Design an enzyme around this catalytic site. Structure first.
Site, PDB file in Angstrom:
ATOM      1  N   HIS A   1       0.818  -1.224   0.000  1.00 27.66           N
ATOM      2  CA  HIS A   1       0.000   0.000   0.000  1.00 27.66           C
ATOM      3  C   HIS A   1       0.860   1.287   0.000  1.00 27.66           C
ATOM      4  O   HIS A   1       0.288   2.377   0.144  1.00 27.66           O
ATOM      5  CB  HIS A   1      -1.004   0.007   1.167  1.00 27.66           C
ATOM      6  CG  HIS A   1      -0.409   0.248   2.522  1.00 27.66           C
ATOM      7  ND1 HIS A   1       0.087   1.472   2.918  1.00 27.66           N
ATOM      8  CD2 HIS A   1      -0.290  -0.569   3.597  1.00 27.66           C
ATOM      9  CE1 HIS A   1       0.517   1.389   4.165  1.00 27.66           C
ATOM     10  NE2 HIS A   1       0.301   0.161   4.600  1.00 27.66           N
TER      11      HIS A   1
ATOM     12  N   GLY B   1       3.578   6.298  10.381  1.00 30.09           N
ATOM     13  CA  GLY B   1       4.943   6.087   9.960  1.00 30.09           C
ATOM     14  C   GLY B   1       5.554   4.769  10.384  1.00 30.09           C
ATOM     15  O   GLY B   1       6.688   4.473   9.985  1.00 30.09           O
TER      16      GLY B   1
ATOM     17  N   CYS C   1       4.318   1.804   9.582  1.00 28.81           N
ATOM     18  CA  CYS C   1       4.012   0.758   8.615  1.00 28.81           C
ATOM     19  C   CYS C   1       5.297   0.155   8.062  1.00 28.81           C
ATOM     20  O   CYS C   1       6.261   0.865   7.764  1.00 28.81           O
ATOM     21  CB  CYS C   1       3.160   1.316   7.475  1.00 28.81           C
ATOM     22  SG  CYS C   1       1.440   1.655   7.922  1.00 28.81           S
TER      23      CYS C   1
END
Ligand code: NA
Ligand code: NA
EC number: 3.4.19.12
Lengths: 301, 305
Positions: B41, B143, B145
């Site tokens: 993503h 942040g 991820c």
């Protein structure tokens, strides 16, 4: 979101752990630049653990009595000195993995990470706090002496604790990296007992502010209190007194949430009086006191 | 003595963390050999996140759209490929700090360590368990991820988790390193909710054994029970079924303490049926279920890596 007790990444400290052996005793040392630091009781024997004379014991040691092992490498000791309760072994090789570092002495209520080690090898990492009675509630087995506690800020490792011993109550005592003990303890196996422990009040208030941030408000109330009336009450639950320094430290969290510090003190007073009624705060059924006001901003705001 | 929630030492993984940037999005990547792994993503934008077509978005991308940053050194992307929900960016440099490693998928109730990162910078480490509903109760801010979960055995890192998103309950969802989600979740801006959670029974029992080993013995009693009789009480309180395999796995601790599993189950039954009478176990007023039997044996034996 979420709120975990979080430890610092341990890599920078892993690269500094070594094994130190004198006679039958093996424990952990900290290899920084060309110096290995470890607890001085590594030179103590079975015969005289009650009243070791460390000055007399150290003068009798040669450099080659100290066996230092970094991983598979053996390091050559070329000199030794004692600084309070910490032994400093000079070695011929500087540690190439030495991070940016400094030595700091912390105050009760402050938190740090512990890298538990055995035979110079890391076992695990956990977060803990210096209790008001200068002990720590750690997880340490035989051979963990010399494991260290630290914080990491940007890229600088601040070493604040070295483990030396366990007390009869099951809690742990140690020194800063200049060898000064936290609390009234000595590196002798004579009878010693930790002072009655208390709850770190400023940390509890910080954690209640963190709960409000993360959306939890069920414990708030419409009351306020005077600082003095709060301390009179909290002392009766074995809570540490709250000082005006603590009130100032909480100033930022009081702004981000709009709840005045003495307002939150009234809520804490009510929680001590009522308990949690089956409810929880941030996943805990007890009041948590190992998050500092700093940590709360680090992990939330 | 003492008992703490303990994470694996994180040094071997810190050497693999990098920053990945595509367009406006910046998240964390895992650099192993000459490949960087991260959530797919990262190629999404506002318009597409509600209902994207990752096949289509990716063929549009070019290698130069991905900015990969290892500390202050910049890695050149030379290929990109998708495997389920993780993006694989091939770089021109193998990571000299690549540990001995392996990709594994864990089961609910198993524990791992998470290295939470921000902008590729490792920031903290914590120990967590894969919940029975396939979420983890983590701590993640924007942040994070691409932060990864792992175990260590001997000198080998087993990567088992990569963080993808947060759910409205505040809990978190992610994939294994082959891009397969844990749980019934998709990487999209759609309505998603964790299933009702349960308590990991075999881990609670492991933690009670740890309490005994550390001298906390007040909850023990003279009684024994049956697997069948305990499980009917467990189901009553939303506890996971206790299988015969769970009993065998607890064998070592039952031998080390002299409390048979079904002897301890009786104690857990009584704790479910009566509460804790106003006292604690290992400093907790709740039953801890994020320690596996293996975790308990290892902290009480002092295994190192
Ligand atoms: Na109030
Ligand atoms: Na029993």
């Amino acid at each position: 979101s979420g709120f975990r007790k979080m430890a610092f990444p341990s890599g920078k400290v892993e690269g500094c752990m070594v094994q130190v052996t004198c006679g039958t005793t093996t424990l952990n040392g900290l290899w920084l630049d060309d110096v290995v630091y470890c607890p001085r009781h590594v030179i103590c024997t079975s015969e005289d653990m009650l009243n070791p004379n460390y000055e007399d014991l150290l003068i009798r040691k040669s450099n080659h009595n100290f066996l230092v092992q970094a991983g598979n490498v053996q390091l050559r000791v070329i000199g030794h000195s004692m600084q309070n309760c910490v032994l400093k072994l000079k070695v011929d090789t500087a540690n190439p993995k030495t991070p940016k570092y400094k030595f700091v002495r912390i105050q009760p209520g402050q938190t740090f990470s512990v890298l538990a080690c055995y035979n110079g090898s890391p076992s695990g990492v956990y977060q803990c706090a210096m209790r008001p009675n200068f002990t720590i509630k750690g997880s340490f087995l035989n051979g963990s002496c010399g494991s260290v506690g630290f914080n990491i800020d940007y890229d600088c490792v601040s070493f604040c604790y070295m483990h030396h011993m366990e007390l009869p109550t099951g809690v742990h005592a140690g020194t800063d990296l200049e060898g000064n003990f936290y609390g009234p303890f000595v590196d002798r196996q004579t009878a010693q007992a930790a002072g009655t422990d208390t709850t770190i009040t400023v940390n509890v208030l910080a954690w209640l502010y963190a709960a409000v941030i993360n959306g939890d408000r069920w414990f708030l109330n419409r009351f306020t209190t005077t600082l003095n009336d709060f301390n009179l009450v909290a002392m009766k639950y074995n809570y540490e007194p709250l000082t005006q320094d603590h009130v100032d430290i909480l100033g930022p969290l009081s702004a981000q949430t709009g709840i005045a510090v003495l307002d939150m003190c009234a809520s804490l007073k009510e929680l001590l009086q009522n308990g949690m009624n089956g409810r929880t705060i941030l996943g805990s059924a007890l009041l948590e006191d190992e998050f500092t006001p700093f940590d709360v901003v680090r992990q939330c705001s």
